Amino acid sequence: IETPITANFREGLNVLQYFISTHGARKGLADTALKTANSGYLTRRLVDVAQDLVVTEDDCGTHEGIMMTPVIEGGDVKEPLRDRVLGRVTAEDVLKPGTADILVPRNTLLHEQWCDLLEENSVDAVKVRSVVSCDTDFGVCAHCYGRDLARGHIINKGEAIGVIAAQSIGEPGTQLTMSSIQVKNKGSIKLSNVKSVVNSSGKLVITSRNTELKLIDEFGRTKESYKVPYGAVLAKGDGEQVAGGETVANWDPHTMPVITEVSGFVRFTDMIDGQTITRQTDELTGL
Amino acid sequence: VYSYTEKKRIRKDFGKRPQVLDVPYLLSIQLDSFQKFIEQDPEGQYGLEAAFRSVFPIQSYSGNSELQYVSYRLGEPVFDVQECQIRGVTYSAPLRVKLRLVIYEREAPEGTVKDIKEQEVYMGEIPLMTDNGTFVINGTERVIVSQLHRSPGVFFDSDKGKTHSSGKVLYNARIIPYRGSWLDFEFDPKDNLFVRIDRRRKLPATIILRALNYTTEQILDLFFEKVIFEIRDNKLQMELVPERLRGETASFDIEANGKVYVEKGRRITARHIRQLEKDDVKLIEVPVEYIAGKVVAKDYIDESTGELICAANMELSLDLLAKLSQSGHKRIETLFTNDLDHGPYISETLRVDPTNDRLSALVEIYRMMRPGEPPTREAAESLFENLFFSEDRYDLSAVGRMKFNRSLLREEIEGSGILSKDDIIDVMKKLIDIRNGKGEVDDIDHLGNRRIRSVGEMAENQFRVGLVRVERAVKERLSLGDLDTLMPQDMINAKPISAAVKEFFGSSQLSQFMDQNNPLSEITHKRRISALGPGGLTRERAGFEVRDVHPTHYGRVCPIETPEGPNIGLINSLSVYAQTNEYGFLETPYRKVTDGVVTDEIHYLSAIEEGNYVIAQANSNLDEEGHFVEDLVTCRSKGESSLFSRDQVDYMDVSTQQVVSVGASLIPFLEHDDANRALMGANMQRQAVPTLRADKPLVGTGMERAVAVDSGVTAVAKRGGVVQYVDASRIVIKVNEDEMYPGEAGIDIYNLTKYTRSNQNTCINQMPCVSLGEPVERGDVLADGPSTDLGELALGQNMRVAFMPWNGYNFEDSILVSERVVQEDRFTTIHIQELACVSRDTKLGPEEITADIPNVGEAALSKLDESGIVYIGAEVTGGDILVGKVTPKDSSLRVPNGVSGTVIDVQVFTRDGVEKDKRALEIEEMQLKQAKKDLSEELQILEAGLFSRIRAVLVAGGVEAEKLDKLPRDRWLELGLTDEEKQNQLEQLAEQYDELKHEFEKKLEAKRRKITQGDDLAPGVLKIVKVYLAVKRRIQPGDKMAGRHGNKGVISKINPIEDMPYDENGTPVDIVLNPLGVPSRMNIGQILETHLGMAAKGIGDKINAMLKQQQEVAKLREFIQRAYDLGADVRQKVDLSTFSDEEVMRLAENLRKGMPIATPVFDGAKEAEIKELLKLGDLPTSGQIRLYDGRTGEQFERPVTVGYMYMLKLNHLVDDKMHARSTGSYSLVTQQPLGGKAQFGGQRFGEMEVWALEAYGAAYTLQEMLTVKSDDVNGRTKMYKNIVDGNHQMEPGMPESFNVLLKEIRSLGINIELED
Amino acid sequence: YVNNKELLQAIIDWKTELANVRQNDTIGLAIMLIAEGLSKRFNFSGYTQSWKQEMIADGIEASIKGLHNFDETKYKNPHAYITQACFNAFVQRIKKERKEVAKKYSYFVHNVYDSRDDDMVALVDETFIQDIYDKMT
Amino acid sequence: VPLDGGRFATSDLNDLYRRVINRNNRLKRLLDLAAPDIIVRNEKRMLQEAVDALLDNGRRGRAITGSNKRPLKSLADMIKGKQGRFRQNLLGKRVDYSGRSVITVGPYLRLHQCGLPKKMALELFKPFIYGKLELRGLATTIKAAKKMVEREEAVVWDILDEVIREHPVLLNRAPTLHRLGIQAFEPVLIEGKAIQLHPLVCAAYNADFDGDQMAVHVPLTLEAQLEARALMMSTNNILSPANGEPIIVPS
DNA sequence: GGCTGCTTCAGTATTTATACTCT
DNA sequence: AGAGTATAAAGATACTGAAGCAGCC
Ligand SMILES: [Mg+2]
Ligand SMILES: [Zn+2]
């Protein structure tokens, strides 16, 4: 509604405002009821599908895993690497950013000590073991799992991880509901999946769709990331530092730039009115 | 001026707005309904007359034999209310209907009646409504909740959104009768048009169209327009008016009159349309290609061959055109078509129509309704005919007709109850026009599309059903003419009518026990609008859209008072001023805002008359002249809210409280509170259990009179007079003179009701609020029910409370309570469990009630008397015999395990014609001793006037005043009186005396008849004995309490008096709340109230001191006067100068414990006046004072807030919850321990508990929690033995419910077994 | 309904055949039609589809068994004949069912030997009332 | 009639069975009447329909209702739904040796103990009490012990607070969302009818004190006691197994 | 003839008014 | 337990999925 409620619970809401607040409140209450309703069914299905995973080994004997890396939504970071691997057995030994200088062995359980150790050394990503790629028939090995998360040590051999997982994912359920690149930080730039050309206005326009910018800090850990579409004019090339406030590239979202990436000529060939094209005098400029 | 029951204790009333409409009688719904259900009325209308005139008169199978209706009447209840309440019968009345059967001359309709025969017949026995809108069904007291359903008529639904996921919307139309069958039209993703009946399989609409005897040419003539082509020199120039060409492209050379208007390829502009229209072109050349896709309306016939040169609804062509022009046919008729203005939706359906003639359509309909039975002409004919045009199987009540003729924008509000062809046609036309875009769908939850039933309407409908069955029967028996012996009685029966009425009242979803533990729970169980039951929604079926507040609820339903839980918004409770319109639509008062004044000529407005004007809001200032002092007024016009001028306004609300219900119009400082918490507050306020002693609310809303008066627990004077004899269980008032008619000298005798088990096992007992020898007037309260006080409402006790943490004993929401509350016993309550035992009669003879029962020691029998019944007053614990009863071989009524108490009353009923006991004779004779008393009193008060006349005649004739006072006053005629007219007068007055004596003997003998008699019982019962135990449970750690502002809590610790925070003046607090509860649960009211509370008590201790030590009355007069003015320009304006210098002392004696303060909801008291009142006392305007500890005596820094808050007590008493179980009763199908507290039931160890106990490595506890402790039969016996023998160990075995599952599957053809 | 005249011919034919064994299916269909029609009377067709089907099957078997004895030389209407047969079988079935229900009640009301205290009144002194109400027979 | 006190049920299977046999019997008798095969066919149709409605009602077009229009429960419907043997009696069953009450605070408690009203504790541990009595010789027959306990003589209380000494109880709340909705304790006797609860643990239970209720269970064998003491005790579960954050945050 | 968009259906969250006569 | 019996036309969930089925290029 246009007009808001310009009073508070120390003055007195007059009638209409009390009415409107009432509407909102009852909506909330009905939501809560049906939300408990749905979440119950959801957690039931969850506990049913797993229902049987029991840690029946100690090491499945594999060297696979996921490259755990801190998540970044493009601007601020969403989670430091310390958490994602806090208490999870790494697959292979990790190297300092002094390459060929390991920092921790290959098959060690990463409690807080190694967490801070990797934290200061500016480590970026680690191939950590996982359960999705575990190598066990009828169960999972302990190491692939990690730490019990209720006791500061590896999970023992026999615990029913499936049920605790189901319950943990389901419980909070009732709490749920129902341009350009204006970089602000200072660091090195990296490009990814690049094909481009320097324009007739001095700048370099990128002309692919797998393109992505990764802004590293001075150290070697990525801090920002951004998407640039087919044909966006970068202000700066790779490797150049950048300050906060200024853009690095901007395109036209309201059209599809389809510049060619060679030198030559063009024609009005295969463009014939009546059957293929139409005569059109521009209704804003005229050309 | 004030009622004399109010000058005892006035209430200081804030609020500045002068009210103009007194709150109406809060129970007008039930009474005003059951009034228009039993009332003889002309012109049919409502009531029974409608049911009769809608079934009667009936005639035989052309036997010239009729059975017609004459009149009706209701005789009388054989019993007054209370006797039905006691015996266990239905307070009811008999229906005598005057009927007549007539048989005309044989083979002569015009002929004379061969014989008339009239009679009056007993049919059915209908219950009656007390003066409190209730029924008494089997002793108990029921009530019929109103219902909220969808009005009868036609609704144009949209069904937007998820239809086909393509995005295109649909439209559909439902026509809903009051009784009959719905009919549904609906479109298609393919933009076709379909019909279905009773939500069945689909069909094309042209089916229904033809089955009304419609030819295809008639169809096309009705729906579409015409475009004609006429032979010319060339090209078939078409007659035309240019209106159909606005914005259309020029499919040819738009040229006429020798000049071009629009070139082909260029669309004809609206300006070009205006040019054409001013030019008035009519004929235009048209190429023969442009007329390729036109469809022809009416078929053409050749002249010479006389053939079908063209049919109806045919796609035109070139050769077809040539053949048509070949047969001389100048005119050619096609349909004008478009795609945004006149969509062609009928033609396609006609093309997909698998039917051409009416008969095949009727066959199609029959098959879609009845499968299995092949077609049959007259069968399907009658089926379709009576399915929608039978006066019997289909009806729109007058409201349906109103809604129908209004939705179609017609004006005549009076029509038939059956349909009509033109009406279905107009439905389809309107649905199409919606499909084009002229008109909009209707919203469902709107309150112009729903209506409320009542008890009258539902009862009347059940009565119609009964009449229908009886009518079928009596018509049958009229095909068996045995004349001159068939009076109109043996033809008629009454058993099905009575069965239907009794089955409705005594059992339904809309017939509930009265929720009776509060003078408010009642008055809220009768203003309940439920949207469930028959013809309504369902819990797991209703949607999120009806459950919300619509902007049309403003003044017709409370938005904040609904039961939270699995059904919100369904059982919303009616508003305060909400009437019911003539047809069942709610309405609301508003005030005519004429040119510049706000007069008081009020009007009621429904949900549709309102949505046109602009209504101001309640709180809008104006200066003693009508004119708004402001110039821009807030208003709400049409589901909106915005500023408006000083002249646009039309109406203005009545009073600021007309938005909330009554169950929440009591909470003060509502506008200073949340919404969730106010909701929980009202829903708790309807649960307060009546305590031992009642006490006024220190700070209230000024709406506590009209809740006690308008409910029934009080006892109110019929007519005024002067009190003459009060007594702890009865009041007798000598009526005034003019309030006394010539007969019935008259003294009202109110027999107050003592301890009587209410519906939730809580005593009620009115107590007198007057004393011997004081005036009363009509309507003044005399006795006070449970939870009333001096005429006002009082649900709980107002205590002194301090807001601060205290060592965590009020951690989350717990409450801390002193011992000046468990000692003063101000939260104790009385409970009344009733038990009954009956003497049935099985084989081997019946059972008896002898005080001699077998194989039991004397110790038990000690409390039993000779008859076999425990004495009144005995104290009984669990497992004791109260009535002896021996079976033909013991069946003695024991005490239910767990409960204690002291017997307070015993009842005994005997089938008249069974050997009586002693106790029955005792209760009978005492009832006689009490019953003679009132008649004796009326007797002796009446005898006075006769002897007064005796003295008046004896004064002339040598009066001797010194002898007429020697011998008894019956000797007032024997003195010396000469033989004059006066001696004849003496004889006449003596005969008058003896006549009155005969009358009173007759009355007392009629009472003796009604008492000493037996009574109709359940045949098979010899005697029925009833015991009334009673307990007094006080308070403990575990009970629940709550304020009025949604702040509930479990009392946790009972505190010694010397540990409580006491202020600098020794006075300890009672209760220690928690402040953390406020800032999140934003209920500021509970704190703000607490300030005012203290202030009020401050004026109490200012009088108590002024009055305890003596003080002249002039000072108290002056001080109370000051306290009563105390404000801004408020409405109260009471002056003690008019009082009589004595009752002032009474007023002070009532105030002396606090001056009660009123606070209208949205006209409350501001902070300035709260502080002004606090200053009139002496307390700090901050409202916070310094306290001390009681355990250490060291001051609390940070001054805390103490005051007086009105605490309740909710009846979730812990002893009703606490429950355990060692080993009890198993079931038979599956030997799992039973469930519940009534039975000795175990606990529910559900799924989730098994998941959780499984997440731990807990593998043995999970085992024993489902094999030994529940089901393994051998295992659990061995477990009991090993537990007694000090050996904690188990032998698991295999469960039993599993083997049940096996034998249950294997009982199907499924071989399920176990391997090795 | 079905014609009254053709049934005469069909039954005469089958009776002549009996004088030589099975009925023509036409008269069987006619009997089924009339039985199912009477099923929709007002005094019946009022309570439940679980009984009504049993009544109809019983009446059909009764009328089939009883058509063995139909006088052909007199009383030329068999409409009323079949109606009466199915009517009688209907009422017998209704009696049997009602008495089986009363058996359930009478077994109930004779069991006050359970676990423990606080037995009801209505729920128990109402089954008795129905347990006696049909016992008026 | 099942006859589990109070209301009497029907055990509706009987009804169905009867009808089947009924029609079956009827069919046989028509094979002794040589009826028009249209009627034998109609009877076979009825028989098929009846057997079907018995095995799994509602699967055929219309379900049959006994009264109240409530479709009667066929055989298969004793296994489907929320109420078949599976979701009602094989997974979650009711249990003996259990109780229920309202809860309160008692902020004087340690972390590994909870309140337990004297009445309830007396009712739950009864067979243990009988065992100790018949061990000490304070009675001879079981009924002697029962009457002794019933008169609540001053000797039963020392026996009680003896057996309680290290006998853990399991407390539970209604919606058992996660693993920390059921925890073990060692109880101390209380003069009331309510359960004391350590104010730090009312986060795992998500239990306010607006009148919530809780259930009490009692392990019996050695293994269950050892497990409740070493696994589910309230002083072993301080780290929410979802994420290792502590769950004993003072609220 | 295979491929494809509607279409229909299946799955989930106490308490019932009336032979007759034998035999 | 059985058996002869003769007017009668007597209804507002909401969402998801998978096979079936008419039709087309
Ligand atoms: Mg709560
Ligand atoms: Zn592994």
Author numbering:
A (entry chain D): 755 to 932, 948 to 1056
B (entry chain C): 2 to 890, 915 to 1341
C (entry chain F): 10 to 29, 37 to 153
D (entry chain D): 253 to 503
What does the article say, verbatim?
As predicted by the sequence analysis, the folding of H1–H4 is reminiscent of σR2. The σR2 homology domain of gp55 binds to the clamp helices of RNAP. In particular, three negatively charged residues (E70, D74, E77) of H3 make electrostatic interactions with a positively charged groove of the clamp helices, consistent with the previous report that amino acid substitutions of these residues strongly disrupt the gp55–RNAP interaction in competitive binding experiments. The σR2 homology domain of gp55 mediates the recognition of the promoter -10-like element through interactions with nontemplate-strand ssDNA in the unwound transcription bubble. The σR2 homology domain of gp55 unstacks nucleotides, flips nucleotides, and inserts nucleotides into protein pockets at positions -12, -9, and -8. In particular, the adenine at position -12 is inserted into a deep protein pocket, making a stacking interaction with residue Y97. The HLH motif of gp55 contacts the zipper and displaces the lid of RNAP. Strikingly, the HLH motif chaperons the template-strand ssDNA of the transcription bubble.
Bacteriophages use bacterial RNAP to transcribe their own genes. Herendeen et al. developed an in vitro system that leads to the current understanding of T4 late transcription. It was found that T4 encoded gp55 enabled RNAP to execute low level (basal) transcription, which was further activated by the sliding clamp gp45 and its coactivator gp33. To initiate basal transcription, bacterial RNAP needs to form holoenzyme with gp55, which recognizes T4 late promoters and confers the ability to form a catalytically competent RNAP-promoter open complex (RPo-gp55). Gp33 and gp45 further activate the basal transcription activity of RNAP–gp55 holoenzyme by forming a catalytically competent transcription activation complex (TAC-gp45).
